[PDB]
Structures are given as structure tokens and as C-alpha cells.
């Protein structure tokens, strides 16, 4: 699925989205920019914490500045956090099964979704105020491993900077409580499709890897047949959590190595 939340605040977000703890299992962030708006800014590859924060503050590298300092605070909304999560079976197989391919898959899927999300990118202008599309967003996608559940959760944080290039000028993103014509309003009104779109592209890449899938919930919600999913349901130091995880799995008798070869053969 794809959770939707508003970023707390430059500093706040900065350290959070990169706190190595949120990704100790993975060992890496995987952070890369995204969006026509990001490539249009020369932003490519890894993410510079500072660039990211300034970006959240509303200061682009382009030189444009949408920050509105008012007695210490900034009245410029940072952006929106789109979190795409991977089915327990996969998150597990990806981080505890030693099959990095599944992580790549996860990424690719998010990318395939994030675009469609980008398409809805809009801005406001009057003539009366109206919402005109743009087709671009600036983004920073980070990968985290655990969840509030303290369970493996290969999930990416698609942080959409609250800026959009329209007619040259960098204006803020379309907001509109009323007519729900705002970019974010359309995001809310497509969460299932986009969450499904992300899962759809993943169930295809995984199956091409030789893995099978099964429906477990509505709108798609599937899981990899046979993964001890349940051994991580019903509910410090990252390292202590890792070991725990490793231990909890060995005490299931699942044959990670075999389940893998099982697939390698089934496709190849
Ligand atoms: C800014 C911020 C984000 N987040 C992130 C990581 C969480 O998985 C997520 C919110 O999802 P919940 O668990 O529904 O957003 C925090 O947990 N704390 C923070 O203070
Ligand atoms: Mg997180």
C-alpha cells in the first residue's frame, strides 16, 4: 500500500529520512532523486542531506526561494511523504532471505508508480483560482527496513518536495480543501490505485524471478506462499533487533536457501 502523510519540517525530516537506524537491516539508504522537476534541476543520483533540507525549506538550488520566514518559523509546507510498503513475505525474503534482487524489484515498482503520481502534479493561479497540471515534482526516495510494528518492512519514503515548475517559475504545489482539485487531493483520491499500481508492478517482477503469489486481502494484497509471515505478527539497538529477527526465523524451520532454489528453477 501507499501511506500519505505531510513531512514534519526540514530539520525534522532531514535527519529522520536518513537516520541509518531506519535502515540498519538493509545497510544502505538507496536514496535517489526522482521527477521531471529534479532532473530539470540537475538533481541526479544520491541525495545531499543539505540540498534535501533546503529543498524542504523551499530553497531550490536553481536559486528560487519559496520560504516564508515569519518570526522564526517557516510558513512553507515541506512536502508530502508517499510510503510504498512491500508485503511481509517479500520484505522478509529481501532482508532476511539474502535475495537483494527483491529489493531492486521493490524500487523499480515504486518508480513505476511515482510517475503516475507525478502526472497529477498541479499548481494554482487566478484569472478566479484554477488548478493547472504541470507533470513534474521533485522527489527524494528513501528506503527503510523496520516498521512501527518492529517487523521487517521494506518500504520506500517518496518525499515530494512542495514545489512544481510552471511557466518557468517555481510555484508551490496545488492545494484546495474545497473542490478537491489539488494535487494532494487527487493523491488521496487514488491511493488504492497507486498502492495497487506499485504492488502490481512488483508481483510481476517477483514472478519473473520464479516466485509465486497468493491473494490474501482485497485490492490485491498478496503474499509469497510459504514465507513464515506470521512469525512476525502479533508483535533499543538495531543490532539486537537484527539478531532477534534472524533467530525468530531459524525457529520456523523455513528453508530460505531451498525456497530460493525452488524459484531459480521454476523460471530461470
Ligand atoms: C517525520 C517523521 C516521520 N516518520 C515516518 C516513518 C514512519 O514509518 C512513518 C509514519 O507511518 P505510521 O507508522 O503510520 O513516517 C516517523 O516515524 N517519525 C517522524 O517524526
Ligand atoms: Mg520509516
Swiss-Prot record:
Disruption phenotype: Loss of conjugative DNA transfer.
Residues that, per the record, bind Mg(2+): 144, 155, 157
Stated consequence of mutating residue 17 to F: Loss of DNA nicking ability; still binds ssDNA
Active site per UniProt: 16-17
Entry's localization field: Cytoplasm
Disulphide-bonded residues: none
Region (DNA relaxase): 1-268
Function description: Conjugative DNA transfer (CDT) is the unidirectional transfer of ssDNA plasmid from a donor to a recipient cell. It is the central mechanism by which antibiotic resistance and virulence factors are propagated in bacterial populations. Part of the relaxosome, which facilitates a site- and strand-specific cut in the origin of transfer by TraI, at the nic site. Relaxosome formation requires binding of IHF and TraY to the oriT region, which then facilitates binding of TraI relaxase. TraI forms a covalent 5'-phosphotyrosine intermediate linkage to the ssDNA.
Free-text comment on this protein's domains from its UniProt entry: Has 4 domains; the relaxase domain (residues 1-330), an unknown domain (residues 330-990), the helicase domain (residues 990-1450) and the C-terminal domain (1450-1756) which is required for conjugative DNA transfer, possibly via interaction with TraM.
Subunit structure as annotated in this protein's UniProt entry: Monomer. Part of the relaxosome, a complex composed of plasmid-encodes TraI, TraM, TraY and host-encoded IHF bound to the F plasmid origin of transfer (oriT). Directly contacts coupling protein TraD. Seems to directly contact TraM via its C-terminus.
Family, per entry: To TraI of plasmid IncFII R100.
Protein's recorded name: Multifunctional conjugation protein TraI
UniProt source species: Escherichia coli (strain K12)
Portion of the parent chain present: 1 to 300 of 1756
Amino acid at each position: 500500500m501507499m501511506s500519505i502523510a505531510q513531512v514534519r519540517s526540514a530539520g525534522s525530516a532531514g535527519n529522520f529520512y536518513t537516520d541509518k537506524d531506519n535502515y540498519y537491516v538493509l545497510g544502505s539508504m538507496g536514496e535517489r532523486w526522482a521527477g521531471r522537476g529534479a532532473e530539470q534541476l540537475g538533481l541526479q543520483g544520491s541525495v545531499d542531506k543539505d540540498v534535501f533540507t533546503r529543498l524542504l525549506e523551499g530553497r531550490l538550488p536553481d536559486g528560487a526561494d519559496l520560504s516564508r520566514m515569519q518570526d522564526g518559523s517557516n510558513r512553507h509546507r515541506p512536502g508530502y511523504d508517499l510510503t510504498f510498503s512491500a508485503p511481509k513475505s517479500v520484505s522478509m525474503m529481501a532482508m532476511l532471505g539474502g535475495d537483494k534482487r527483491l529489493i531492486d524489484a521493490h524500487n523499480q515498482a515504486v518508480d513505476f508508480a511515482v510517475r503516475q503520481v507525478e502526472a497529477l502534479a498541479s499548481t494554482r493561479v487566478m484569472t478566479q483560482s484554477e488548478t493547472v497540471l504541470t507533470g513534474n515534482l521533485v522527489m527524494a526516495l528513501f528506503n527503510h527496513d523496520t516498521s512501527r510494528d518492529q517487523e521487517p518492512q521494506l518500504h520506500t519514503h517518496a518525499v515530494v518536495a512542495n514545489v512544481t515548475q510552471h511557466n518557468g517559475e517555481w510555484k508551490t504545489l496545488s492545494s484546495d480543501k474545497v473542490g478537491k482539485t489539488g494535487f494532494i487531493e487527487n493523491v488521496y483520491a487514488n491511493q488504492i490505485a497507486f498502492g495497487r499500481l506499485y504492488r502490481e508492478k512488483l508481483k510481476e517482477q517477483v514472478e519473473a524471478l520464479g516466485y509465486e503469489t497468493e491473494v490474501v486481502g482485497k485490492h490485491g494484497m498478496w503474499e509469497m506462499p510459504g514465507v513464515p509471515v506470521e512469525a512476525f505478527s502479533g508483535r533499543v539497538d538495531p543490532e539486537i533487533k537484527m539478531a532477534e529477527w534472524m533467530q525468530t526465523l531459524k525457529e520456523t524451520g523455513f528453508d530460505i536457501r531451498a525456497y530460493r532454489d525452488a524459484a531459480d528453477q521454476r523460471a530461470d
